Every structure is written in C-alpha cells, then in structure tokens.
Amino acid sequence: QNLKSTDRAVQQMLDKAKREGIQTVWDRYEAMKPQCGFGETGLCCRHCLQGPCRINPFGDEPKVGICGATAEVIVARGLDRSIAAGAAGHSGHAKHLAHTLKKAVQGKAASYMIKDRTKLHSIAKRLGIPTEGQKDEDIALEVAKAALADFHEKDTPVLWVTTVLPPSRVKVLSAHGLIPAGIDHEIAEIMHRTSMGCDADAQNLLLGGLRCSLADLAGCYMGTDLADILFGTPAPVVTESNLGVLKADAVNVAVHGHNPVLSDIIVSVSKEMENEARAAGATGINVVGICCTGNEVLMRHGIPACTHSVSQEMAMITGALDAMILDYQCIQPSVATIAECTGTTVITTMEMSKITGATHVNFAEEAAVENAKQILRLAIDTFKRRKGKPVEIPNIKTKVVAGFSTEAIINALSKLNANDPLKPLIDNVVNGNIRGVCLFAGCNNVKVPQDQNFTTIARKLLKQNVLVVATGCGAGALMRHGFMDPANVDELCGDGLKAVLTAIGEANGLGGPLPPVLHMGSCVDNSRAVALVAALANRLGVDLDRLPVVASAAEAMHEKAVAIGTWAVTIGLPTHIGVLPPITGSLPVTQILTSSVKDITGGYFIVELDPETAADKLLAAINERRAGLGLPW
Amino acid sequence: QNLKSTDRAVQQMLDKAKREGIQTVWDRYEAMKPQCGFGETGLCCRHCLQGPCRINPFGDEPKVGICGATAEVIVARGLDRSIAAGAAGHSGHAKHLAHTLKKAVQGKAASYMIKDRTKLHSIAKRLGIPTEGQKDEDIALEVAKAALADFHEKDTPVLWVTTVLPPSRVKVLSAHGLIPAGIDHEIAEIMHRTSMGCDADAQNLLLGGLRCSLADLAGCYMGTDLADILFGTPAPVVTESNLGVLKADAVNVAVHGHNPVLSDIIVSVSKEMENEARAAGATGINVVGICCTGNEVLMRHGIPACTHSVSQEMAMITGALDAMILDYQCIQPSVATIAECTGTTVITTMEMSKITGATHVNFAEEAAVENAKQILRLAIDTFKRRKGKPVEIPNIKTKVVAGFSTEAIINALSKLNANDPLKPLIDNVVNGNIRGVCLFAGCNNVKVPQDQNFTTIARKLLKQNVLVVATGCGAGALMRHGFMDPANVDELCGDGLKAVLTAIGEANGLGGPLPPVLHMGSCVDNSRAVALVAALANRLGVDLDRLPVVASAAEAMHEKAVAIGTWAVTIGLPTHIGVLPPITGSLPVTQILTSSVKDITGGYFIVELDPETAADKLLAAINERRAGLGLPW
C-alpha cells in the first residue's frame, strides 16, 4: 500500500478496504489505466459538436482540429477553461460568504456576526471605505457590497486585486491588460473566448488566462477576508491530525468541503449538543475536518484534521465515521456509495452540490443553528446504529501547531522587533539563516503516491534553511507527516532555520521553536501568503518577482489548483507543479508558461514530476532571486 | 462533392480547393476519422488533473471516473459546461451592445445613436422604466444600466427572462428554481458546480443547465433588443444569397462573426468610401455577409449573404474576397492560413478574439468610423494586388426576402386584422391552413452534408402546411436553397400554407405571397421567435407548452446552439437536434432530456439524425399539440 499512500493510517485503511471489497480512488485509477494520451497532453477538444477533435502529439494526421484549431489553440483553450473553473469555485465560495455577512448585519441571520472588528475595519480602510463615525454594521454592509460589486464590471477594476498587490505590481499587470474587470465577468469572457471560432492565438488566450487567474486570486482573498470577519482571524493553535483523531466512543462528524459558513456553525452547535450525544451513549460529538473546511475549523478552533484530498474515503473505512457533512468542492462522489457499506451518513447542504444517494439537508444561514441540529441528530442516530460494531481506527496521529495567519506571523515576529516586525525575517533572509520562502499549496493526486512529493521536497528545502509555509491539502500532507510538530525541528531544519524558528518561538514564550512548517490555512488562504509576500515586497521597496519566494503545487489535482498556480506565476513567483498539466502537447504553450511569461510577469511555471529534482529547481529559483538582490547563496 | 455540401456553389469551390491543394474543413474532418467514441458519447472527463477519465459505453472497466463520477454525472457536467459556454458567447455579445449604447448616449461614441426610438420606449416600458417626461438619452441610459445589471445578482432576477415570457411560464420555471439570478452569475455557478467534487446528481446538474440556458436566452433577447435600438428593427427587405453575390470588379469585403456594432458601421462607411474604391480601379466596395453578423446586416440593410457556417472558407477560395472582417464566434481559424493562399486580408477587431497570422485592427466604438476606414483601406489595397488575377466566383445565387422581425410579422398580419394582428395567424392554425410553426435554428456541422437536414425537413413540413421561420445558419441554409424566394411558394408549400402566405402578401401590396420561410434574423434573434411565440401564448391565454410550435437545430455545431436548444426545451418547446450531442453514454441523462423534462417544462429534446424521420417526429409533436388544443390534425 506504500505505492498508493505514504501515510501509514491510509495504508492500514487501504488494507481494510481491500479485505472488505470496497473500491477506492486508487482502484478506480488502476481501472482507468492506460489513460488517454490525447487528454494527458492537452491535445483533445470537445468545444463543439463537430468534435471530438484530437491531434497526435507526434506522427501523422490528425494534425489540426476540424475548424482549423491548432495544438497551441486547443491546449491554451483547455487550460483557460480550467482556470475559469477554478476561479468559479473560489469566487462562488467568496460570494457565499459575502451574502452571509450582508444577511448577518441586516438582521437576517443571527447565527452570524462580526467576530473580528479589527479585520473588518482594516479591510474597509484598504478598500477606501470610510469608518470614521460609522456603525460597524454599516461598515460591514459596505464591505459586503464592495465584495459583491467585484463580481461584475463597474467604474473600478477588481479591488480584491488592485488593493492587495503593491502598486508596482498592479502597474506591471495593468500594462499587459491583466487586471480583471469583474470576477464573473472574466469567467464568462474565458468561456466565450475559448468557445468555437473565437480566440485562436496562444499568447492572447494565455494572457486571458492570467487575467482570469487574478479573478481567482481576488475570490481567494475575498473569501479569507470575509471568513476572518465572520469567524475570527486565526492565531496559533495546537491540535492533532490523521485518522487517530477519530474516537470509537464518540459521535464522529467530519466536516468536508470548503465553506466555513457551514462548518463553523457545526462546531459551535456540536458543543451545545454534548448532553444529547451523551444521552445516546456517546462521550460527546467529535467534530473532525476533511479538506479545506477542516482546515478552516482547524485554523480557527483547533478542530483536529482527520484526513485530506485523495485519502478522504479512508475516514469512512474505519467504520467510526457517523456523519460526513458536505458543502462543495473536492468531495469524491464515491463517498455516497461507500457510505452504504460503512454506515456513514453523508449529508449534502448546498443546492448546487448534491450527490445521488446522499441525504440532503438544506442549510440556510437564516436557520443555521436549526439546520445544524437536524444534521447532528442524524449523526447521533447513526452512532446508535453502530453500537457493538467493531471499528478500526488506526492509532496514528501527529501533533499540529497551526493558525499562522499573516496577522499571526506578523505578531510573532513583532516579539523580536515591535515596530518593524518584518525586519527580523528580512534580516535572516539577508544573513542566510533563511534562504527563502516556499509555499506548498494544493491537492494530493492519485497519480502520485500520497504526500511523497510534498514531504520529499519539504525535507530538502528545510535542510537548506527555506522557510516553508503551507495551505490546503499541502498543509494536510505536511501536518500528517509531522511537519507541524515543533518537536521535529531538530530533525528537519537546517541550523539557520532552526535558529530563527527557535528565536521567534522563545520570544513568544514557547520555550521552544515555531513548527518546521507554518500552516497558513485553507486554499483560499493562499491569499494570506500573498498578503505576507506583498507586505515583504512593500517593506523592501521591490516587486514580488525580486523576492526569494517560490510556490509548489507538488501534487496538484483540482481546477482550483491550476488557477492558484497560474496567479502565483502572474503575481511574479516561480511556481512548481508536480503533476503534468495538459500542456505538453504544445511546445509553444509550454514555452510561454515555463519561460517567456518571465518577461511579462516575472513568474514562471516549473513543471517537474520528480520531487528531488523539483526541490533542486526550487532551490535554484530561490538562489537566483537571492543573487538578484545581491545576497550570498 | 455532393457528399460534403448540397450547395452547388460550395461544391464548385470544393473542386477548386482540391485542385489547388487547399485543405478545407471537410478534409480536416476526414483526417480526424474515426473520432473518439468516448468523446462522442460524452463519456470522458478532464475536469481535474487525475484525468483524463473515460467510461466504456459498454463492457468492462473503466466503469466510473477516478473520483467516483458516474456516467450520468460526467455526461451532465460536460453538457452543462457547453450550455455555460454558449451563454457566455451570447451574453458577451449582448454586454458589448449594452456598453455601446451607454457610450452612445453619454456622448462618447458619436458613430452610434438611438435609431429606433419606438423600440427603446417599448423595451423601457417592458422593464418598468418610466419614459413619461424623460429624455430619450436618459431612458436609453437606464435601459443600458438594466442590461448590465442582469449580468449579476441584485434584488430582482434576470429581467430579460422574467419580463419576456408570460407570467404562467415564469411561474412554472420559478417553481423549479430555474429563473436565473444573473447571467454571468449562472455561468460561473455552472463552472463551479461541474468542477471536481461538487454537484454529482444528474437531475440537479441538469436543472442547473436549464437555468443557465435561460441566462443564454436573456443574452440573446438583450442582444436583439439593444441591436434594434442602435441599428433599427428589421422590416421586410429583398436581397440575394450565395457566392454569386461576390463581384470580381468590386472590392469584396465579408463581414463575419456576430456583433452588429462592427458590421453595421462597416456597411455605412463602405458607402462613403465608394469614390476611393473607384480610384483604386474597383466599381465600389461590395460588402457581403458571412454567419450571423452577415445576417444582422442582411436583416437591417439588405446586404447580400455570401455564405454560412461550415462553408465559410469557400468564399476565400473564389480568389475575389479582398477582406474578411472578424469580430468573434463561429470563425474557423483556418481562415488565417487559407488567406495566405488566396490573398484575402483577414482582419480581427476584438481584443478577446485574435487569430495567429491575421491582421489585428483594434476597433473602438469611440473611433468606429476611423477604424472602419483603416480596415476598408486594407481591403482596397488587397483588391489592387489581385488586378489581372483570374477569379472563380460561382455564378450561383438566390433571391432572398428577409427582415421578418416579430414587429414586422405583426405588422404584416395587421393588414388582415388591424387591431388583433395575431388573430389571422391563429384563425389559420385553427382551420388547419397552418398546421403549426417550426423554428429552424443553429449551425451547419461538417458531419452532415451541408444543408441536407434543413432542406429535407423544411420541405416535408412546408408540404404539411407548417409555417416555417428560421434564424442564423438555418436561415442561411434555407436562403441559399431558395426557401426565401416567394417565386418558390407554389413548389414548396401545401395549399393551406400557400393560401395564408398569399393572403398576407397580397394585403401588404406584394401581388404575391410572403416567402416560403420567414427569416427572423441572427442567432440572438432566436429571441424574436420567443417574442412571437410568447405573444401568441398571451393572446391565447395558454402557456407555450400548449402551442403547436417546435424548433429544429437540424445541423447543430456550436455550444451556443446547445444553449439555444436547451432554452427552447426550457420555455416549453419540442426541440429537434439533428446531430448527436454528447449524451448517449448516459441513458438516464438522455431519458431526462428527451422524456422526463416534459414533466418539468413541457418541452423536450428530439434527437434524430435522419432528417425524414426528424420531420415525421416534428410533425407528430405539432399534431400532439393540436390535439391538446382540441383541434383537428
């Protein structure tokens, strides 16, 4: 099972699933081999009913689409649609939060409120919304309105791009026409321009893609901003991760999907229902996280993470998962069928994300507590049905220190320099104790032994004194392998990095270092990394494409990860992707994305499937940036 | 060549292209055979980087997507994305027109103006915008603002749906949650819900699709409304069609794409530049139409139609096409390469629709006349370069009577009944002189011998006294085969239909009948057919799903045609499609689209590749509606 996942808890559940004849994502992958080489290389088009069209990567006909679409057009159009789809996810998430905030302050959803007033005011200031002599509720109404306004054309561009990147960066992007006019506007324009008989120039198409990726960034940043206002800005918290956080004697409830609007209420209501759970013979309700919504409640509340991404089915295979509460995104629909074998109650809650065979309980912010109780009572009923049934919860978990929002990081650093908190970080970049910064982001992918790329690359970078930050299922991988436990600093970290982590930790009263990797939160919270990097850029008076900062979507899967990778490139970062996106069928497109885009945005993709090699390439990128700043490396 | 196109002019140019070694759309199709059976049936998914996934239509593994996505999910998700892409095209078009109207009335684009004041006022009234004591420019500003507001969420649903369908229809749709909240909002929501690990219930997905198809309808109706305000509501006009409208001794300029914002100015400026053209040795500038933008200028100005859809390259093969002026949609990018062989200057004009190797001349409404002159001077230069070069323009053309907007149809009928103009039409439906109404819409498709389905089906329906109306390349097919020439009424029409066409024509002073088929305009002008059918519904006091009205996308190709077909079904029409959409890989999805959707909207798809059989099925659908109204059939 080591060939499927490097996580021992997952391996144990794979053996259980095999024994019990429960088909998994890895079995469905094996059944799909060999996969279509046209799709793999991007050389397939189904954008009209004359198709499907394909182009042989090499050899003879077909060489061109029926309408005349070249390999470079077909590849660029497919990629653009993936970016649009990612943008649609992150911005749908953000939109949901914007409506929730509006309802909350209009008195229509009393389960929700302004929890972080400071964040609300700072966001208002950043957007140009006056706060002086204004009621919080009115300020919040204006912020929510501004959020919703960024989805469409208006007299200003997307403020959740133009107000979050340094002016010099916005100028570079504006010069190339890359600043989005409206989030849903760009999504629609991509779908239009990539439809049959429209845009048919690879560079033009890809520029469109870069712009749509910034619409995605805006959705991410908006999602983080709004979630922080509503639910609180994360601060350092200690919890645990992996399947061992499940408890046989508790009602185990996984929150899974993305939106904290749902999970955050589940967490609070579950505490209120402890006595009901105990009435049913349980110790209480044990809420655990899967995927991003698990990350959201881990970051804010220390809710333990059960599992992530590709291994999500394994939580169910334990036999102890009484409910899986879903909103949207990254949920393998197999869970609905597996639930019939495992006893788990899978519950959908959002109108646009249902799964055949799952129970649907409409969630309305207006009735959030009521709807949460209904859902949790289904979970309690399910716990009762497994009375006396043996379960197999792998006794495997790690300690996780998390909650490193950008505010939290700035605060931690401020203990070393109160009025110039970024300076200690920059000092240590300059003196070589910190070589650079690497953001690990995005998914696991069944094609890559689970977590192998994240851990292999992280290990090499940490030994080379790279400050590693992580989000989403990248943070999931690293947390499950001990990278968020400060007890592992001596083993994992180079002497320089150790010194800095220790110095910061001891100044924050820890008697010990920060963890080896800083968990910056969910996938939308990649926007937090942007806030940190942009703040460093502003402090240094240089653009992001001069900073020794890189990203790695080491095991990418979702269209959202493609969008994130693309905006990482667009804002100026060397951006590693550890799975093949469908671009290799066009050398010109590949060359643009991995090379000539450097001349446009300063960022570039690094496509590298071998993780040792990827680490070397990321180190080379970091060191090139160091040299560019006149620093030793 | 009869196996490729039933159009003799096209056949002649195919022989020329063969002789000269110029590859065509038919050659690229042959080179693509056999096409992928997974794509053909819809059983392929590339929505994440674990893919490509496929499902064998029959047999053994693979049976399910890697994430657990079933055949019914994969098929529904692919279809939904096609609908969104169509919606994005039609609504991008509409949005462009809305911005143009706004600029025009704000004094920023003096080449544009309110040409149809009556239409402006009627639209304002329909939207609830007060006109009483208001300046036209202010009314137009409010209409343009309303248009742009329909793209996003607001306190009202999409008004270009809710104000254009009868209340009873809106109620049925609202009950099923199918009324769009915002055009780009729905497009984005589709892309989100169809992304990995989101919506995974076929019915839920398809309901989303129906709603997004209404966003497309809104974009179409908005496009027609705005184009009519700006450029004039069509009225009956006589012109010609087919390659014989090209003139060797003239500067031949094709307008190609969709948006009249561009073509309409080309037409007016070309008249102003006659003397310059004559200075260059030409007789003048001969503007001719291809595809929808050709339909727009044919409908308003009687500009002759050169060709349509699948045969667009053949205009170039003549050697006499000096320029092809492009905006977006349905342009085979092969034209840019073919231009190098034929001498034609291919000019793109829109930032989001470029073609490698074509000349790009940015068009800005603010400088429309200037930009038009620049473009037409390139065409004149090109005419000069072919001095003394033989050309082969097939001497083949038909007479075309067109310009049947819904206003024009109502006016024509009003000559038989001034104060109840729809009544004469309804009278003849009731007495059997008109069996029903069929709308032919959409594209040609290289898979179907060009025009064969449109003409075969139209011939059968006309003999059975069906009133046939047509738009887009359906109108193109029928016009090129003589179906818009009143001289062909005796040959084509049943006695009942002939009687009615003759009665209406003679009351309008023609000394002769209306044409066999009524040309209702471009693809967005399918919205005109909706206006007519909705007006008939209102007059009768019944919903559209009780009317003997059907649609046929007989040779469909573009994602836009899929969207149009889908909203035809959603508003309550039996809707024939004459090519296989990628749905046959899921019986449940097929059953929903062809059968159970009847219970939701009253409309349904009729998938039928054999045109004789399709005609029988359409007649059966019409007759079933007749019987439902208690009428003989």
Ligand code: SF4
């Ligand atoms: S858009 Fe072009 S390449 Fe794509 S399916 Fe249609 S004909 Fe083929």
Ligand code: SF4
């Ligand atoms: S979304 Fe599911 S079916 Fe589609 S490519 Fe990804 S794993 Fe395969």
Ligand code: FES
């Ligand atoms: S030919 Fe396999 S992805 Fe289309």
Ligand code: FES
């Ligand atoms: S396997 Fe051919 S369309 Fe994907």
Ligand SMILES: [Fe+2]
């Ligand atoms: Fe996520």
Ligand SMILES: [Fe+2]
């Ligand atoms: Fe069209």
